[PDB]
């Protein structure tokens, strides 16, 4: 089945925490990139993650409060109104035929 | 200066050929992915290219008439009306903080 992401919890109190879980990662991965919003856009990149070295590198939209895990999961702490809405994950395969999934939680 | 792409020629007769040139490739590249349109969208991916292995892999929007070169350049032969408009290159860096550039020509 399709690459998918869900957020835990779906509705998050301001100041609390949310984990973006990822399911059905394909094989032969090179890396992951998370973006704020519904689309892949470098200006809105949160983080880039190289699997070979297990190394996270921040993008322009990185808040300082995000952590990516080896299975692509994204933890966000001390959430703000600004964190609310859509997130997009791009999975970079080793053949560079890539996949995206979006991506939502609601701050209250 | 910024990663850019220009098309040669910019206005192309139906049935002829167009080369999408790429300038200012950054260092530390792992590969390239070309998309039809203004955005990175897997459903519209033309090709994925691994630099290390020199291996091109076709995506869903591949027409059969496209060739990617080691410097990311894209040749399109026997162009159709359907080929007209924007193309987007994504450059995949080793730290996964990637870059995109668009991308157009006009068929007449
Ligand atoms: C700090 C706690 C994080 C531990 C990992 C939690 C992931 C548990 O697993 C997830 O549980 C969800 C329950 O809502 C299910 O909907 C998902 O299908 C399942 O993958
Ligand atoms: C103090 C941070 C707690 C994390 C918020 C989880 C809320 C789940 O609760 C719904
Ligand atoms: C607070 C830190 C949370 C730990 C981060 C890793 C937890 C991820 O846990 C994994 O998530 C996957 C989907 O993303 C699923 O395979 C399973 O729910 C689980 O094994
Ligand atoms: C093979 C074609 C290469 C042409 C290089 C032109 C560089 C910018 O030319 C406009
Ligand atoms: C091989 C791909 C076909 C590309 C060759 C046609 C490019 O035509 C270009 O037109 C430009 C108009 O200003 C001229 O400046 C260039 O010299 C010319 O190469
Ligand atoms: C077969 C390719 C011809 C050179 C490209 C020019 C297309 C016409 O367009 C100017
Ligand atoms: C007609 C097919 C020939 C293959 C193309 C040869 C490589 C293209 O040529 C290169 O294009 C780059 C743009 O990507 C430019 O930056 C370089 O200056 C130029 O040498
Ligand atoms: C170092 C890069 C080598 C790439 C191999 C080129 C594969 C595309 O084969 C193409 O065949 C066409 C004939 O129909 C020619 O007009 C093109 O010049 C050629 O690129």
JSON list of C-alpha atoms in Angstrom, two decimals, chain A residues 30 32-33 35 41-42 45 90 92, chain B residues 90-100:
[
{"chain": "A", "resi": 30, "resn": "UNK", "atom": "CA", "xyz": [18.72, 7.26, 0.04]},
{"chain": "A", "resi": 32, "resn": "UNK", "atom": "CA", "xyz": [14.13, 11.81, 3.58]},
{"chain": "A", "resi": 33, "resn": "UNK", "atom": "CA", "xyz": [13.13, 15.43, 3.44]},
{"chain": "A", "resi": 35, "resn": "UNK", "atom": "CA", "xyz": [8.63, 20.23, 4.33]},
{"chain": "A", "resi": 41, "resn": "UNK", "atom": "CA", "xyz": [9.57, 23.56, -1.82]},
{"chain": "A", "resi": 42, "resn": "UNK", "atom": "CA", "xyz": [13.14, 24.23, -0.76]},
{"chain": "A", "resi": 45, "resn": "UNK", "atom": "CA", "xyz": [12.25, 22.56, 3.96]},
{"chain": "A", "resi": 90, "resn": "UNK", "atom": "CA", "xyz": [9.58, 13.25, 0.34]},
{"chain": "A", "resi": 92, "resn": "UNK", "atom": "CA", "xyz": [14.44, 9.89, -1.96]},
{"chain": "B", "resi": 90, "resn": "UNK", "atom": "CA", "xyz": [15.33, 18.73, -8.49]},
{"chain": "B", "resi": 91, "resn": "UNK", "atom": "CA", "xyz": [18.96, 18.34, -7.50]},
{"chain": "B", "resi": 92, "resn": "UNK", "atom": "CA", "xyz": [19.52, 15.83, -4.71]},
{"chain": "B", "resi": 93, "resn": "UNK", "atom": "CA", "xyz": [22.39, 16.74, -2.39]},
{"chain": "B", "resi": 94, "resn": "UNK", "atom": "CA", "xyz": [24.18, 14.42, -0.02]},
{"chain": "B", "resi": 95, "resn": "UNK", "atom": "CA", "xyz": [22.75, 16.19, 3.01]},
{"chain": "B", "resi": 96, "resn": "UNK", "atom": "CA", "xyz": [19.24, 16.02, 1.44]},
{"chain": "B", "resi": 97, "resn": "UNK", "atom": "CA", "xyz": [18.73, 19.80, 1.69]},
{"chain": "B", "resi": 98, "resn": "UNK", "atom": "CA", "xyz": [17.78, 19.80, -1.99]},
{"chain": "B", "resi": 99, "resn": "UNK", "atom": "CA", "xyz": [17.20, 22.43, -4.65]},
{"chain": "B", "resi": 100, "resn": "UNK", "atom": "CA", "xyz": [14.76, 22.91, -7.48]}
]
